[PDB]
Amino acid sequence: PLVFEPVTLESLRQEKGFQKVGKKQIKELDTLRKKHAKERTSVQKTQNAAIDKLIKGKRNDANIKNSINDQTKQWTDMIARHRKEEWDMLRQHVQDSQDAMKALMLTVQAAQIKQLEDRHARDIKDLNAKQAKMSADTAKEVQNDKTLKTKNEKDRRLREKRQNNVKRFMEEKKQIGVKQGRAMEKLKLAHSKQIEEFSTDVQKLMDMYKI
């Protein structure tokens, strides 16, 4: 409900509306980490078979030592594979979500303007109460003031105060109008700064996962 809140990428992530997609993405990846884990035991178990086939005779044969060397680079090649497979998904994760967030950023800022506008118009409404009460209570003062002499006399002074009063409201109404136009402008640009920045923060993230 806050009128000048920075809409950063991290902030965009916390918005309730993105929780559903965020939750889905965390699983999709977790399952793969599980898939990685199975792929490792399966290869690990397969690796073992070779010893039964090869070391049944039992004197360290020259061929076996080379073979075990050959196996190790088959593990580290799958280890290093599983690395890039996760990161590749992480970078691809961002791209799909980024399209969604852009559409959500817009409705977060637009929310800020609608919150401000209804706040502006209410400040307007409050001033008229100040103005309307102000004008009427002054008249009450005319009756209250003893110095009045005649009804024709009472009216004349009221008209004069009625001009001094209106000099204020014209300025007060004009001065307020400027403050609102300025307040919206300084806001409405911050939006188009946070948005020109967002396009290039998403990019900065994808590169971090690039390999």
Residue numbers in the entry: 865 to 922, 928 to 1080
How did the manuscript describe this experimental structure?
Like the coiled-coil structure of mammalian PLCβ3, NORPA CC folds into an elongated three helix bundle structure with an N-terminal short helix coupling to the middle region of the helix bundle. The packing surface of NORPA CC-PBM crystals involves an extensive surface composed of α1–α4.
At the inner surface of fly photoreceptor rhabdomeric membranes, the master scaffold protein INAD (encoded by inaD for inactivation no after potential D and contains 5 PDZ domains arranged in tandem) forms stoichiometric multi-molecular complexes with phospholipase Cβ (NORPA), Ca2+-permeable transient receptor potential (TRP) channel and eye-specific protein kinase C (eye-PKC). In this study, we show that the PDZ45 tandem of INAD functions as a supramodule binding to the entire C-terminal coiled-coil domain and PDZ-binding motif of NORPA (CC-PBM) with an unexpectedly high affinity. Our biochemical and structural studies demonstrate that INADL PDZ89 forms a supramodule and binds to the entire C-terminal coiled-coil domain of PLCβ4 in a manner that is strikingly similar to that of the INAD–NORPA complex. The striking similarity between the PDZ scaffold and PLCβ interactions at the molecular level might point to an evolutionarily conserved molecular adaption in PLCβ signaling in the animal kingdom.
